[PDB]
Amino acid sequence: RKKRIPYSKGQLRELEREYAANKFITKDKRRKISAATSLSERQITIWFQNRRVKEKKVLA
DNA sequence: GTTGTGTTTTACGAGGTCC
DNA sequence: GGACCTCGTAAAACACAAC
């Protein structure tokens, strides 16, 4: 705990790209995106959790 | 050029599901 | 008995208004 570190443009690109392809992360694509983005698997799992909330919220 | 103040983006854990 | 996602929460870090 904690501390709040925003994700860079490059990381989000990669994360948004895979999400646009499949909303849900696999274990294999998770460890691929980690290597490519240098983000932790945990961070990635969390961003995905939070990204689904957003897609849900934004329906309006 | 900065004080208002929403809203959004990262964490995390109780609560419950699926192996 | 951990891996994991419904929602809830908390606070960083924006995004606008304004005088």
Numbering used by the authors: 217 to 276
From the paper:
The most remarkable difference between the complexes is in the conformation of DNA of the HOXB13-DNATCG complex at the position of the divergent bases. The absence of ordered solvent molecules, and the lower resolution of the HOXB13-DNATCG structure is consistent with the possibility that the TCG sequence is preferred because it represents a relatively disordered, high entropy state. However, as predicted, the CAA site displayed much higher change in enthalpy, and larger loss of entropy compared to those of the TCG site.
To elucidate the mechanism, we performed structural analysis of two homeodomain proteins, the posterior homeodomain protein HOXB13, and the parahox protein CDX2, each bound to two distinct high-affinity sequences. The optimal sequences for HOXB13 are CCAATAAA and CTCGTAAA that differ from each other by the three underlined base pairs, whereas CDX2 binds with high affinity to similar two sequences that begin with a G instead of a C. Two parts of both HOXB13 and CDX2 DBDs interact with DNA: the recognition helix α3, which tightly packs into the major groove, and the N-terminal tail interacting with the minor groove.
